[PDB]
Each structure stands twice: as structure tokens, then as C-alpha cells.
Design a protein around this motif. Structure first.
Motif, PDB file in Angstrom:
ATOM      1  N   UNK A   1      10.550  44.814 -27.652  1.00 39.37           N
ATOM      2  CA  UNK A   1      11.665  45.458 -26.949  1.00 39.37           C
ATOM      3  C   UNK A   1      12.921  44.756 -27.468  1.00 39.37           C
ATOM      4  N   UNK A   2      13.810  45.509 -28.107  1.00 39.15           N
ATOM      5  CA  UNK A   2      15.012  44.943 -28.713  1.00 39.15           C
ATOM      6  C   UNK A   2      16.311  44.994 -27.910  1.00 39.15           C
ATOM      7  N   UNK A   3      16.504  46.058 -27.144  1.00 36.32           N
ATOM      8  CA  UNK A   3      17.721  46.235 -26.363  1.00 36.32           C
ATOM      9  C   UNK A   3      18.236  44.965 -25.690  1.00 36.32           C
ATOM     10  N   UNK A   4      19.529  44.705 -25.855  1.00 38.88           N
ATOM     11  CA  UNK A   4      20.153  43.528 -25.267  1.00 38.88           C
ATOM     12  C   UNK A   4      20.145  43.661 -23.748  1.00 38.88           C
ATOM     13  N   UNK A   5      19.685  42.613 -23.076  1.00 43.24           N
ATOM     14  CA  UNK A   5      19.610  42.608 -21.624  1.00 43.24           C
ATOM     15  C   UNK A   5      20.055  41.259 -21.051  1.00 43.24           C
ATOM     16  N   UNK A   6      21.324  40.895 -21.284  1.00 40.21           N
ATOM     17  CA  UNK A   6      21.897  39.637 -20.797  1.00 40.21           C
ATOM     18  C   UNK A   6      21.973  39.607 -19.270  1.00 40.21           C
ATOM     19  N   UNK A   7      21.825  38.421 -18.688  1.00 38.96           N
ATOM     20  CA  UNK A   7      21.893  38.282 -17.239  1.00 38.96           C
ATOM     21  C   UNK A   7      23.055  37.393 -16.793  1.00 38.96           C
ATOM     22  N   UNK A   8      23.811  36.836 -17.740  1.00 46.95           N
ATOM     23  CA  UNK A   8      24.919  35.958 -17.372  1.00 46.95           C
ATOM     24  C   UNK A   8      26.237  36.671 -17.120  1.00 46.95           C
ATOM     25  N   UNK A   9      26.228  37.997 -17.201  1.00 47.99           N
ATOM     26  CA  UNK A   9      27.439  38.760 -16.946  1.00 47.99           C
ATOM     27  C   UNK A   9      28.388  38.965 -18.113  1.00 47.99           C
ATOM     28  N   UNK A  10      28.030  38.471 -19.293  1.00 48.93           N
ATOM     29  CA  UNK A  10      28.880  38.618 -20.473  1.00 48.93           C
ATOM     30  C   UNK A  10      29.324  40.065 -20.704  1.00 48.93           C
ATOM     31  N   UNK A  11      28.461  41.019 -20.371  1.00 51.11           N
ATOM     32  CA  UNK A  11      28.760  42.436 -20.567  1.00 51.11           C
ATOM     33  C   UNK A  11      29.168  43.133 -19.273  1.00 51.11           C
ATOM     34  N   UNK A  12      29.465  42.346 -18.241  1.00 51.41           N
ATOM     35  CA  UNK A  12      29.816  42.906 -16.938  1.00 51.41           C
ATOM     36  C   UNK A  12      31.261  42.705 -16.508  1.00 51.41           C
ATOM     37  N   UNK A  13      31.695  43.539 -15.568  1.00 57.02           N
ATOM     38  CA  UNK A  13      33.040  43.462 -15.024  1.00 57.02           C
ATOM     39  C   UNK A  13      32.974  42.572 -13.790  1.00 57.02           C
ATOM     40  N   UNK A  14      33.932  41.661 -13.667  1.00 51.44           N
ATOM     41  CA  UNK A  14      33.982  40.752 -12.529  1.00 51.44           C
ATOM     42  C   UNK A  14      34.700  41.412 -11.348  1.00 51.44           C
ATOM     43  N   UNK A  15      33.939  41.911 -10.357  1.00 48.66           N
ATOM     44  CA  UNK A  15      34.489  42.570  -9.166  1.00 48.66           C
ATOM     45  C   UNK A  15      35.318  41.612  -8.312  1.00 48.66           C
ATOM     46  N   UNK A  16      36.434  42.107  -7.787  1.00 54.64           N
ATOM     47  CA  UNK A  16      37.302  41.284  -6.954  1.00 54.64           C
ATOM     48  C   UNK A  16      36.670  41.061  -5.583  1.00 54.64           C
ATOM     49  N   UNK A  17      36.691  39.810  -5.134  1.00 54.06           N
ATOM     50  CA  UNK A  17      36.146  39.440  -3.832  1.00 54.06           C
ATOM     51  C   UNK A  17      37.126  38.461  -3.203  1.00 54.06           C
ATOM     52  N   UNK A  18      37.412  38.646  -1.921  1.00 54.40           N
ATOM     53  CA  UNK A  18      38.330  37.747  -1.241  1.00 54.40           C
ATOM     54  C   UNK A  18      37.622  36.440  -0.906  1.00 54.40           C
ATOM     55  N   UNK A  19      38.368  35.334  -0.893  1.00 54.49           N
ATOM     56  CA  UNK A  19      37.822  34.012  -0.593  1.00 54.49           C
ATOM     57  C   UNK A  19      37.235  33.847   0.806  1.00 54.49           C
ATOM     58  N   UNK A  20      36.186  33.038   0.894  1.00 49.07           N
ATOM     59  CA  UNK A  20      35.537  32.723   2.165  1.00 49.07           C
ATOM     60  C   UNK A  20      35.104  31.265   2.111  1.00 49.07           C
TER      61      UNK A  20
END
Ligand SMILES: O=CCc1ccccc1
Ligand SMILES: O=CCc1ccccc1
Ligand SMILES: [NH3+]CCc1ccccc1
Ligand SMILES: [Ca+2]
Ligand SMILES: [Ca+2]
Ligand SMILES: [Ca+2]
Ligand SMILES: [Ca+2]
Ligand SMILES: [Cu+2]
Ligand SMILES: [Cu+2]
Lengths: 718, 720
Positions: free
Chosen positions: B282-301
Motif C-alpha cells: 500500500x503506497x498512498x501517503x497516510x501521515x498522522x502528524x498533521x503535516x497535510x492537515x489544517x489547524x482548526x481554531x480552538x479557544x484557550x482552556x
């Protein structure tokens, strides 16, 4: 000007002063404010606000404008609450509608003088139209209607009113149905016992010197086909009594073996059952700390200085990928409606309606004062009506938002329950994590949105949490706390003569006090629409099979999958080792699997588990309430089937709930299904739970199963 | 001179918050909650004023501090979270120096060898009675500090005992037929052997791989198969499962199925290469560290405790409300909770002498060549303590946590300090109790739980263990699992493909050409509970429906069948969550005459389907070798040498040397020192929601006081 601390605390806001920073931090629900004395501006949820009148210090006492609270809190910088311009079709009846509906039935010539109202609720619009409103903004072109159930003396009358057109649509007397217990019935019972010469005599016999210290409790009598000697047509209640000794806890002073039967319409005791006399446990057992001093604890705060991640528009709650509607019912409490999950831009259906279905707390002692004891808190008493306002920071975390809810009382007058429900977000460990050896770690924190409601009926306080996980899972937990119903016994320790007989049906938790064994059985009605209306129930049983592939292994781990096509087969015990899915045979994920939701009726608990009903199949309570003996049920969607124990469970003669809804054994293949989860506990008491019981919880879960194509929380692709 | 504040404070591991409106810095690091304003003479530490030598200086919007600011503030003493231990606890783990001393002592032996590695160098436990006398009576342990030194000489295990107090060797005993656990250098050894293997490079090439340098290997134990696996029992072996590095940071998503090499460690060579059908990687890239993801905004807690914690950490001992216990670290099983007492209105009562993970196993159910032998005993064969994963501040544990460093020895005998090894944190857990009497003032108190969390990663799995001390006497123990799944490469892309049916017979198709092979997660906890003393008895309480014999309308009643379990054989059993099991103290009763006891609940819930037992036919070797897998409750007589469910040397073991062995003589469990073992598992059938990375799944166990007290434990101090 006006005093700050005084004004703010009347407003319900929390005030913190930091002398080092010369900064005031004001907090109330979604608003997190910071203002410094003399400053021309303030901060509301991270945003700057100009002030007309700065805060001024007068003799070490801060003072503010008489318009301060409005300018700062109603400023608009707190976006937690948004106005609802288009009213959601499932919104609960408003105070005006409650009053309009009562006027409509009172105008009818059939409305009798002292008629009461067991329930005044919204008549459910058709499901399709509601989904269209939530998903397409399409207006519901059907007049708002309200069901109005009345109790005329002991007679039930069901009426329907058109709220938009202001007219009576129907008025139907309900033959042989008994009405639930109403608030005024509590006073009657006490007042009737008080004016009873015979009862007073019976009490004197049992050692009570002053009958005016006798506290009564209104208990439903159930049904026994006459064996209990009770007339099936008379509106009755049995009265168990206690002795008030001034410790604020009369539950610790049972007057054992004394049972009075009250006829609410004749307004008098129609039977007194007397058993062996047992001295009343007298020792003071307060539970409110009047005789205690709590240990000093360092402060702990959970803060969201920029506001909440959720938005509450009217009753619609938005949070992350979740969107749902929260409403209140006087009988079952909170109702979660039109729940969708925004999957990368597209809202997919998850649950049309979810709420408590019903619950029961049946006992296992055969004696005169316990054999009939089987409480249907929601059904017979109305848990929504008996909602207990949340104690800010204690019943719910300090970062919670407390909502007020409105229902109608038994006289048909609007009733606003303050802090009826708590909404709060919480850290719940890491969402996922992988520390690959010698590589940069990968972790993301998990957040859960909790909706909490607490109802107290008599001595039990019940806590319900509807937990929304970011990854699509939904949890439903039920907690129980409060005061146990105890039996007065002669034994003080297990070394006394009667100890063995006294503890046959319960543990000796205190001197002369036994916590009678019983069960806590909760049922949840979950009208799930997995990515659509048409679904099917699929079973997946992990099994061990012989290896046929060759090699050293003699066995393998395989799955036994099969559909469950009808209601009778859907009614079953739940094996927490098996898997049960509600699938959508019409939609699949990227790998070709049916989008589904895993149903887990039992995901844990802190008390022993109830595998079924601890009753022989010939017991009447068992015959009347089939839902107790099965953890899972799946029926065909029907607007009028909403209670596991039936619509009128008071002194019912047969199962009108889930027993009736599934009697027909209809098809559950690719159609609109409604899931009912029953989860219970068998409670055997211990000393650690007296005078007050530490909260015990049970957990249930609904997990997306191949509903998505990958980890739902990785985020959207760049 | 000075240094930049942010950069430096981050390096230090402190959270730095700047409030522009208040012109105030808020600094948080473990038990220290600090507030400091630019140009101020003092700072605030846990509500207390601290005079600064050099004030914080703001320059062109950049803050700067003295090079002594970190030490002066964070080690000031105004943070009382940590206190110095005046008298060393007898259970304190070996220090760095002691570790080095033990190593010098064995290297002083004429028999020591060069390649000699150390599987475990740990304190040799003093006698239980002395330790309890020290914790309760403060009596000194006049027995010498000794240390167990288990060595691996090539493939031979040698058990040595050194006397640290007198710097002398006490014993050196070789252990025949015993294999040693997998060591860190075996990982590199395997990858290297495969790289130098001309044949393996050939086997790989024919399977579609072009650059053999991108092949990532994994070291797996082979278990025992009476010879059917055609593997010599005497040799120290390991099987190699391979993956292709595609550059997505996740080689686990690129299996090279049906290719298994058997490596002989001492011989440093591939002694066998099993090959099955070729399956495209299986060759398809499947990163899990978020390199290919958008960082959703979240308010501080933030969860904060501005005046410090409610607990104190003296040396390794933790004090919190009514609890007192010692916390140490072991290289094999990890965290060890010791001498746990509960202060009952002045009197410290025994609860647990020693508790910790016993062992765990993750067995698979696929019969093929690359899976049939796969059954991991992470702690036993890999050493979870050694593989502890540093806690990611604020994510792996709440922001109000205190992170502890722990020191153990590595395989070469050199002291090793694990940063952020364990997390300690108090948490709000809803209302302790509540009662709203109608028409009366409400009564509620909040619940607080002290959590002790440890995380260990072995290969692809990441395991989280929480030891939860409830203020009311209850003790919870949860196990969480996350990480990356071990998948099988298959030809099907969807369930619509011809091979789908056969490809998913032993697991779910969670991604194109990827199957999450079904398996189990079986955890076992060794809990040496001493309920208000050593001598206890195991009692059963089965709720039952019995016919009504008291007259009246009812046909049935709810009663309880109570009986004692007098021997180990009868104590080894399945757990019905509908029944009650107690470890009582027949010598002590509460105010009502009932035996003070603790309710043992091996199964209190979980997020995955529950493992009712071992998903193996009774004739499988793994089932035979490891019997703890099939029972959820075990109780044995106390023995300092019996500490592992799977046995002391599980690697290629031929018979059960663990719980099967510890209870084989079926000894008496009546009024004697008992040791409780809880086994709890899950059967994992995969789904797409768990790929490429699996959201944390949990299992819960519970220990509740049963008539140990006379009333609600948290009511408070009696005013009169
Ligand atoms: O919760 C059970 C029935 C009840 C109702 C009101 C007071 C006491 C008991
Ligand atoms: O964790 C179990 C055995 C293992 C070890 C190292 C890499 C992959 C798998
Ligand atoms: N017809 C809706 C009920 C109503 C009644 C009075 C004012 C506003 C709304
Ligand atoms: Ca449905
Ligand atoms: Ca039906
Ligand atoms: Ca033994
Ligand atoms: Ca013990
Ligand atoms: Cu109960
Ligand atoms: Cu798994």
C-alpha cells in the motif's frame, strides 16, 4: 454609582480581585471580563470595550455605573448566545403558548372546575418537515399544536389545541387510565394523615410521642390483580412514614411496618396495614454538614478567557462539527433533537430525537411496607417538573454555562426552572497519541461537550449527561446520589439476635437501619437516523473458529455477521463482548462498508450490573414493565411511542410501553428505526453510602462505525 | 547580563501567557503558578510575594530576564509542592549512583563478560513487614540495601544480587532454559542484518520494492510452538516484519505482507526467510502528524490552581487529603504504588502494600505467516518502564498536572533519567454527592480525584495507565490504548472487490488495501491489598432472586448468597459484573459488626467490546503458556518472588511460570496475606475511524471500600 461586589453578586457573577495586578476578573457563564480601576476600557472575552464610566475605588470598595452590567455583559462581545430569528419547530412551548393552551381548554364547556394538568407539551410536527427545516431551512408549514393532558379528579382527558389558529382540535376522555402523581397530592397525603385520629392512634402505639413530627411520602401502589386488596378504579397512594427529629433528615427515621392507604378523591385513609412494631431509629444523622467542618482546599479554576467554543442560538447548540437542539419536557426532561455531524462541509444525520425514555427503582423486600415499592420517577412523578437547579461549580464544573428552562406546573401556570441544565466543555485526556521511537511526538487533546441535567424525586437525585465527543462518539451517563430508602430494624450490629433476619433483603448500614436492596433501571429512547432515515440492525459476534488456512494455529478470530430483521429479535440481552450496529444499507464509506453507529447499552458502571429484572417472571411489576429485562430494543418509528413503561404506568394492568410497541413484531429492514437502551444496576448497600450516597455512575455509548473514512479528528486536508 | 524571557521560559518547559491589557505575565510550570509585571520589584508565586534580584525588562516589545530568574523564582520555596525527604524511604528506587555501584560490583566478578547487557537492575525488596513498620511506626529498616541484577550474557540469563550497603556480591546464579527479554540494541541489530542480507534484498525486490534502503524492520518475539514453527528452542531468535518508508512519517501504513525473516541474534544472521503470496505494498501517503492537515481554531482552556496543589511530594512519597503512598519506577512494569494508607480520623489504615501493572498481552487472530505467532507481552518482552513516553505537557495530561522525572538503568547499566515520566494531577469529577430535599436548601460537594498517569509506547501501540485515588476511599485503575494499528496488506480496495471476503475474514478493511487484523488487549494488575492488615479472606456475594417465603403478594425477593473462597484454585475465576467479590479482614469489623472490606471490580466498563477471555481454542500454545488471559480474577498467597502474570521469563517459555504456576499448589486463602490479580481485556475489531491513527480507547477497573468505614467517608470532620 453602585457597589460592584453587591451588584455583581446579585447578578450571579463571580468576582475576583488581584491586588498585585490591580485587576478585577468577572465571570458569569460565557462572559469572562477583566477591568482595572480607573481604566477607560475593559476586556470581554479577549475583546476591548470602551467604558462610559470607569470603575472607581471608594474606601477600598469598588463602584460602577448603574448601567455597568448591561454595557459590559449585554455588550455583544460575549458571543455565547445568539438571537434566533427563525424559531426552531421543536422549541418547547413558550410561557405565552402554555397560557394560550390553558385558555383554550378552559373555554370549553366540558372543562370541570378543579381540573389539573399532568402535562402540557408541544405536539410533535412531522419528522420529515423538521429535518427539512434543520437541513434546508425549509419552513414548517403546519400550525404549532400542543397536547394538553388533564386530570379531572382522577379522570384523564387528552386534548389537542391549535396554537397558531387558537382553537380546540380534540377532547378525548381516557378510560381506565390513572393520572401520575401531582404536587398537590403530596400535601393532601400529609394533611389527610394529620387529621386521621386512627392513624394518630396507630402511631402512638409505635412509640411516637408527638404525631405532628410524622413526615409522609406519597408512593404509587402498583398493580396486583386484587391480591393487595386495592380497588382498581380508586385513585390511591400508599403512605410510608418517618419521624422528624430536627436533624434535617427524616429518611433516617423510618416508622417500619406502618402503611396507610389513601384515596385522593374521598380524601381519607381507606386502610391501615400494621405489622410488627419496631422502635424508630432516633440517632441524628444530618447530611448537610451542620455537624461537620470541611477540610481546607486550595482553589481550582477552569477558565476560558476568550469565551466558549459553542454557540447557543435560541435552543440550537453548535460546537465543532456538532449541531443539535436542546429542549425541556416536564416528564422526561431534556430532549436532544436534530443532531448532525458536519463531515468536512456536509451535515450528516445522526439522531432525530434522543431523551430519557423512562426509569424504575423496584425493591426486593416482601414485607408489608416494601413489596409494592417500585418507583417510576419520570412516568409517575415527572422528572422534568422536579428538576433540581444546578449548584454552580459543584454539580457542574466552574467553566459551565447554566441554562434556564420553562415548563407548565400542574395548575397550568408557566414555571421557569433556573439553572435547569448545564452545558460545559471538558478536557478528557489525549484524543490520540503516538510516540514513534526517536521521532517528534504526536498528541492532541480530547474535548467533550457535556449537557447535564439533575432531577430529584423524593430521596433519589439523578444526574444525566449527554456527552458529545469531537470524533463523532456520543455518550450518555446516568449518575445516582441522594438518600437511601431504609428499613427500620431491631438489630444494631451483626452480632444481634435479629441481625440475620433483618439483613435478608438488605445490608445493615447503620444501627437499626437496613438499606433495602433494589435496582436502578434507566431506559433511553434514541431515534437514530444513521446518515438517513432508512436503516437496518446488524449483529457482529466475535467468535473463535478452527484454522483452515494451515500453519501452527489451531484457531482464529473471526466475526459472525447477520441482520436482525424484526422487533421481537431486536429485543435482546446485550453481550458487551458482541457488536450491534444500526447501519444505513443505502450509504457506504470510502471502503465500501455501510455507514453505521455502534450501539453499546452497557459501557460500564460503579455499582453491580443488573443483567435483567431481579424478579421472577410471574411478578406483576415484571409483567407490566418488559423493558427491565432486556438491554436492547429496536422498534419502528412512531410519534406516539415514547415511553418504555407506557403512557399511563400508574397502577397499569399490562405492558403498554415497549411490550406493546414490539408486540406486532414488525420488520426492521431498511426502515426508520428507534433504538431503546436499557441499562441498570443492582444496589446492595454499604455503610459508606449513609447518611448520603456518593454519586454512582453507569455509562452507555454510541460510536460511529465506518460512518467516516478515517480518524474524524485529524482535521480537514489543506 | 540578561536573556529573552519567552525563548528561555519555553526551553524551561513553562507555559508563558502575556496579558496586554493588564501588562502582566502569567507563568505556569508544575506546582508553580507565577505572576510578574514588567518593571515590578516583586513577582507572585502561589499567591506569595517574591522579591526579584532583577526585574523583568521590556525592550521594544520584547521581555528580558536575569539569567538567575528561573532559579530564583521556580526554586524559591514559595512552591511547596515538593519537600525534601529527611529519612530515605526503604522502597526508593535505586539511585543513579547505586545503579552504577551495582554494575561495578558485578563487573568485579571474574565471570563478567564484555557483551554482557542488563535486562533489569532493580532494588531487591526488603521484607514487607519492615517496610510497613517504617511507613506506619517510622521504624528504621536495619536490613542492607540490596539490588537484583539480571544480566544477559549473549543469550544466557544470569541472576546476581549485590549488597549496596557493603559493596559486595551476594550471589551469581545462571538460569537454564530461560531466554532474556528484547533489548534496545536488538532493534538496531535486526535492521542491520536485513540491510546486509543479500537474500532478503532479493526477496524484497521481487515484491515490488526498488530501494531496499527504505525498508523498515520490526523485532517481534516468536513465542513457543512445540516445534511446529520449525524453530530451535535453544537459539535466541526474533521474527522480522517489514514495512516500506514512503516518507509520510508513518511506515506502519505500508506493509510488505507475507515476508518474514527469522533472525538469530548471537549469530547475527538471517537463519530463515518465509515467503507467501506477493501483495503490492500500500503506497498512498497516510501521515498522522498533521503535516497535510489544517489547524482548526480552538479557544484557550486552562485548569489552574493559583495557590499551589493540595498534595505534597516528599521524596517519592505523596500525601493528598486522607491518602499516603509511595511512588517509584521499575524498568519492566513501570510505576509502583506502595504502602498505601488512608487516614481515618487520625489513624492510618492499611489498604495496599504494593500495586502495579502485572503484565499485559496483545495476541492476534490471523493464521497467516506474518501473524500466527504475533502475541506481544510488552512489559515482559520489551520493558515498558524503559520505553516510557515523556508526557506531552497539557495534551497527554491536563494543564494543572505536575510532571515527575524518573531514573532507571538502560541495558548497558548506565543511569537513565526519563523526563516527564509520570504525571500527577487533581481533577474535578462531578459532585461527590448531592441531595436536593424539596423546598429545602440544596446540599452538594464537589468530587476530587488524584490521578497518577504513566504512558508507555512499544512499537506501534501507546498505552496509558491511570491510578485514581478517590477522596472517598475508592481506587480506580484505567488503561487507555491509542497509537497506530498493525495492519495487513491486502489486494482489495473496497468490500466490492473479489478478494474482499477473504481479505476481511480476520479483520476489517479500514483503508484501501489495508486491514486492521482483529486482536485483543489483555491487561493484568498485581494488587497486594492488605485490607486494614495482612490477614484477609476472599468473600463472594451473589445477588439472587429467591422465592418469597414471607407471605404477601410477591412471588420473589432479592437476596444474597454469601460464601468464602478458601483456596487459590477457586479464587481463579471469571468475573460476573452482576456479583460482588470482597477481600475482607475477618479480624476487624466496622461500627455495625461487618468485616472491613474492599470490593474488587476487574470489569467496570470500557469503550471497546469486552474480552470475555482469551480468543483462543484451549489447545493453542499461547493459551497454554499464559493462563492469566482466561480469568479476570485471581488471588494468591503473598510471595515476594511472584510478581508477573505471564511469568518471569515469558520469551519463548514452554509452560506457564506465572499465575498458572503461582496457584498450581492450590494453597489456602483463609485469613492470610492475599494478593489480588485483575485481568481485564478488550476484543478489537477495527473500523475506519481508527485509521491512520486510533483515538484513545479505555477500560476501567475499580476497588471500593465495603464497610471499611462506618459512614459516608467524605462527610467531614465531626464538629461534636
Ligand atoms: O422516589 C420515590 C417515590 C417518592 C416520591 C416522593 C417522596 C418520597 C418518595
Ligand atoms: O510492540 C510489540 C512488538 C514491537 C516492537 C517494536 C516495533 C514493533 C513491534
Ligand atoms: N400564538 C402564540 C402564543 C402567543 C400568545 C401571546 C403573545 C405571543 C404569542
Ligand atoms: Ca430513526
Ligand atoms: Ca412497532
Ligand atoms: Ca500459591
Ligand atoms: Ca496482601
Ligand atoms: Cu440505589
Ligand atoms: Cu487494538
Amino acid at each position: 454609582m453602585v457597589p460592584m461586589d453587591k451588584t455583581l453578586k446579585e447578578f450571579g457573577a463571580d468576582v475576583q480581585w488581584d491586588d498585585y495586578a490591580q485587576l478585577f476578573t468577572l465571570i458569569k457563564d460565557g462572559a469572562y471580563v477583566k477591568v482595572k480601576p480607573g481604566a477607560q476600557t475593559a476586556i470581554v472575552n479577549g475583546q476591548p470595550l470602551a467604558l462610559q464610566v470607569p470603575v472607581v475605588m471608594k474606601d477600598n470598595k469598588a463602584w460602577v455605573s448603574d448601567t455597568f452590567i448591561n454595557d459590559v455583559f449585554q455588550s455583544g462581545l460575549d458571543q455565547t448566545f445568539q438571537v434566533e430569528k427563525r424559531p426552531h419547530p421543536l422549541n418547547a412551548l413558550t410561557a405565552d403558548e402554555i397560557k394560550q393552551a390553558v385558555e383554550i381548554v378552559k373555554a370549553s364547556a366540558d372543562f370541570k372546575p378543579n381540573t389539573r394538568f399532568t402535562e402540557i407539551s408541544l405536539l410533535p410536527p412531522d419528522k420529515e418537515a423538521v429535518w427539512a427545516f434543520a437541513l434546508e431551512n425549509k419552513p414548517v408549514d403546519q400550525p404549532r399544536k400542543a397536547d394538553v393532558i388533564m386530570l379531572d379528579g382522577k379522570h384523564i382527558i387528552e386534548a389537542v389545541v391549535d396554537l397558531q389558529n387558537n382553537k380546540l382540535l380534540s377532547w378525548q376522555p381516557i378510560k381506565d387510565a390513572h393520572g401520575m402523581v401531582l404536587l398537590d397530592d403530596f400535601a393532601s397525603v400529609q394533611n389527610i394523615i394529620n387529621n386521621s385520629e386512627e392513624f394518630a392512634a396507630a402511631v402512638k402505639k409505635r412509640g411516637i410521642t408527638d404525631a405532628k413530627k410524622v413526615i409522609t411520602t406519597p408512593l404509587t401502589v402498583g398493580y396486583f390483580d386484587g391480591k393487595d386488596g386495592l380497588k382498581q378504579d380508586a385513585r390511591l397512594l400508599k403512605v410510608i412514614s418517618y419521624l422528624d427529629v430536627g436533624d434535617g433528615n427524616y429518611w433516617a427515621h423510618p416508622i417500619e411496618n406502618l402503611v396507610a392507604v389513601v384515596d385522593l378523591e374521598q380524601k381519607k385513609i381507606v386502610k391501615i396495614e400494621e405489622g410488627p412494631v419496631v422502635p424508630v431509629p432516633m440517632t441524628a444523622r444530618p447530611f448537610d454538614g451542620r455537624d461537620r467542618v470541611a477540610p481546607a482546599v486550595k482553589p481550582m479554576q477552569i477558565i476560558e478567557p476568550e469565551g466558549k467554543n459553542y454557540t447557543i442560538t435560541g435552543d440550537m447548540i453548535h460546537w465543532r462539527n456538532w449541531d443539535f437542539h436542546l429542549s425541556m419536557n416536564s416528564r422526561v426532561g431534556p430532549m436532544i433533537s436534530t443532531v448532525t455531524y458536519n463531515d468536512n462541509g456536509t451535515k450528516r444525520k445522526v439522531m432525530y430525537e434522543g431523551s430519557l425514555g423512562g426509569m424504575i427503582v423496584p425493591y426486593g423486600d416482601p414485607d408489608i411496607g416494601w413489596y409494592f415499592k417500585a418507583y417510576l420517577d419520570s412516568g409517575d412523578y415527572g422528572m422534568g417538573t422536579l428538576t433540581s437547579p444546578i449548584a454552580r461549580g459543584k454539580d457542574a464544573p466552574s467553566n459551565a454555562v447554566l441554562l434556564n428552562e420553562t415548563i407548565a406546573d400542574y395548575t397550568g401556570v408557566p414555571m421557569e426552572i433556573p439553572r435547569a441544565i448545564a452545558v460545559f466543555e471538558r478536557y478528557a485526556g489525549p484524543e490520540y497519541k503516538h510516540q514513534e521511537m526517536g521521532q517528534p511526538n504526536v498528541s492532541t487533546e480530547r474535548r467533550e461537550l457535556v449537557v447535564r441535567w439533575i432531577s430529584t424525586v423524593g430521596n433519589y437525585d439523578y444526574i444525566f449527561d449527554w456527552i458529545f465527543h469531537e470524533n463523532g462518539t456520543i455518550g450518555i451517563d446516568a449518575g445516582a446520589t441522594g438518600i437511601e430508602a431504609v428499613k427500620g430494624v431491631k438489630a444494631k450490629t451483626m452480632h444481634d439476635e435479629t441481625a440475620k433476619d433483618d439483613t435478608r433483603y438488605g445490608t445493615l448500614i447503620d444501627h437499626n437501619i437496613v438499606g433495602t436492596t433494589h435496582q436502578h433501571i434507566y431506559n433511553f429512547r434514541l431515534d437514530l437516523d444513521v446518515d438517513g432515515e432508512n436503516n437496518s440492525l446488524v449483529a457482529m459476534d466475535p467468535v473463535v473458529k478452527p484454522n483452515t488456512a494451515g500453519g501452527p494455529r489451531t484457531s482464529t478470530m473471526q466475526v459472525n455477521q447477520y441482520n436482525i430483521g424484526n422487533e421481537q429479535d431486536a429485543a435482546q440481552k446485550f453481550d458487551p463482548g458482541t457488536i450491534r450496529l444500526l447501519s444505513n444499507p443505502n450509504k457506504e464509506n470510502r471502503m465500501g462498508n455501510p455507514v453505521s453507529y455502534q450501539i453499546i447499552p452497557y459501557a460500564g458502571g460503579t455499582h453491580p450490573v443488573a443483567k435483567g429484572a431481579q424478579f421472577a417472571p410471574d411478578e406483576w411489576i415484571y409483567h407490566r414493565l418488559s423493558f427491565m429485562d432486556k438491554q436492547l430494543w429496536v422498534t419502528r418509528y412512531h410519534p406516539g411511542e415514547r415511553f418504555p413503561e407506557g403512557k399511563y404506568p400508574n397502577r397499569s394492568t399490562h405492558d403498554t410501553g415497549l411490550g406493546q410497541y414490539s408486540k406486532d413484531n414488525e420488520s426492521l429492514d431498511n426502515t426508520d428505526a428507534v433504538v431503546w437502551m436499557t441499562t441498570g444496576t443492582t444496589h446492595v448497600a454499604r455503610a459508606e453510602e449513609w447518611p448520603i450516597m456518593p454519586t454512582e455512575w453507569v455509562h452507555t455509548l454510541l460510536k460511529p462505525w465506518n460512518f467516516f473514512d478515517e480518524t474524524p479528528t485529524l482535521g480537514a486536508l489543506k
